[PDB]
Amino acid sequence: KDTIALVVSTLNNPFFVSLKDGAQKEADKLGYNLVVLDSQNNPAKELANVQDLTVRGTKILLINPTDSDAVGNAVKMANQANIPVITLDRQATKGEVVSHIASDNVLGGKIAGDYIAKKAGEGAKVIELQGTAATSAARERGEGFQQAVAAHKFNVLASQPADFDRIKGLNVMQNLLTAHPDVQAVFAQNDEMALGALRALQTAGKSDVMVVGFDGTPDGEKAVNDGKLAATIAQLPDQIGAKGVETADKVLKGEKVQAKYPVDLKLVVKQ
């Protein structure tokens, strides 16, 4: 069996666990050996992961960048080693990439903003918990959210990165809460930060604040169902992973593939 490598940004996020399971199930299906490497959100670790794979007989590299701008050196090393690179979920700003597979994060952010305006009303006072700064996913969701801010005249009280992490999202929201107790709604750029934000609101006794997450992970869907999370934009991580391995197969078989493959989003609300 030919080996396909999957370098994922982190395995400490349910979203990336499902992405890995999607790839594993498709690799099993198509008869490939799948090696999984965790970069642990560290560009230095990511680079070393890629350097080690280029000599393991890896035929194709599926990579989820820890940083869209810094991953360029790793992609270029794969390029020198003649190993095709497919990015999943986040882009690579530099280096040659065969195909990129992800959601429309600009649309995702806009839909989140529109839903908030529908519930909390136009001109609502909002806070935004942004993802890791140098990732295409976070940059795009902020951009889509900025279109909603302008359309619905939201008053953005504060906007700060909590790095797609639940504990950080918790602490950042705790601090912004003390400084802006008049917040009406919060857009968290992933479900982990949205879950952390809910816990901060719980600790602070603020039951009145509407929170919108992003991903539709098991925990995020449970919160929406329990009525704790107002909504989440569901992604299809398992299908981003499957589409990556499927696309890896086509490349290895000499079939040309599209440069971009979108994966649908869906607004998830209770009922």
Ligand X SMILES: O[C@@H]1[C@H](O)[C@H](O)CO[C@H]1O
Residues that bind ligand X (CB under 6 A): 13, 15, 89-90, 131, 135, 137, 164, 190, 192, 214-215
Q: How far is the CB of 191 from ligand X (least distance, A)?
A: 6
Is the Cβ of residue 15 or residue 145 nearer to ligand X in the bound state?
Answer: 15
Is the Cβ of residue 167 or residue 179 nearer to ligand X in the bound state?
Answer: 167
Q: How far is the CB of 59 from ligand X (least distance, A)?
A: 25
Q: How far is the CB of 12 from ligand X (least distance, A)?
A: 10
Is the Cβ of residue 86 or residue 124 nearer to ligand X in the bound state?
Answer: 86
For ligand X, the nearest residue by Cβ is 137
Is the Cβ of residue 187 or residue 214 nearer to ligand X in the bound state?
Answer: 214
Rounded Cα gap, residues 63 and 75, in angstroms: 9
Q: How far is the CB of 89 from ligand X (least distance, A)?
A: 5
